[PDB]
Amino acid sequence: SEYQLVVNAVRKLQESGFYWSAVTGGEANLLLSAEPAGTFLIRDSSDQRHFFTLSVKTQSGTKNLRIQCEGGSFSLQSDPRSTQPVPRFDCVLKLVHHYMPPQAYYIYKIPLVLSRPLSSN
Template sequence: KQHTAPVSPHSSTALLDAFDSAHPSPEDEEERLPKQRHASGDTHCSRQPGPWKVHTQIDYIHCLVPDLQAITALPCYWGVMDRYQAEALLDGRPEGTFLLRDSAQEDYLFSVSFRRYNRSLHARIEQWNHNFSFDAHDPCVFHSSTVTGLLEHYKDPSACMFFEPLLTAPLHRTFPFSLQHLARAAICRHTTYDGIGALPLPPTMQDFLKEYHYKQKVRVRWLEREPPLKVK
């Protein structure tokens, strides 16, 4: 998809802040943690004007990454890697050299590390409404239904704003993925998140297959109001 709307100044500021190594993000400080699945319904309590409290429940669906097999086949995908390892690999490389890796944060699946402005920068890939983007909540920023489609767009320097990743020269992985990793990608191509639960596999293996997934909000329900507890 190509967006012709003017670029929001807020998006450029946010993305530049994300790329600025002087402002380390939580991802910069953490190694990748195992992704944990969330409950399908999260309950929240919000304060409304007056003495009443209103409870809301947010319902989610869980979806597998649609192009996991294509991602696994990318020469530029390195799997589990923190920012420091990525920076060591990119050090001294030409402008536009990049790699794709697993994000260090639970709320994100993938990140790109790339060379621009004579330094190594990092950007998380966000997901919203089944689309992937470097700023999912700004409609002016390009988004794609697949991670591979997102990377393909930013290979064209003429399509990249000054604050966006430039991904023109993939840094090739120097090792093969395990057979277990490749098998997961192949299986996930032919099933769904819920479909994995119906497979005749032990729970630990089902959890392994579900690792690369995201959750999508589908409904917000307002539950009954209740008065605050009176303290005697």
């Protein structure tokens, strides 16, 4: 706890296969440019107060959603107009599952839908 929880969360995130080290926001755009909507990856944030950012190919182009790490649990940055509290997760696989609806939450009003992590090749 207090550091072990954080480092264990980071570790497991790094290990997940969703995570792309040494990829910028611009490079995420390139990687996701030719991919179908709902293709996503997690990468390092270039922001001072964030470790990680989720990049997702949406119906309306590539969007970026900062990941919050409070208490060593993960959540996606939430609009204060949310009527529900922010769901939070002790692992990234659960986070990702939560935002995989079948054909649901939205971004400012376009659906946020993850479907498949970006693969190498």
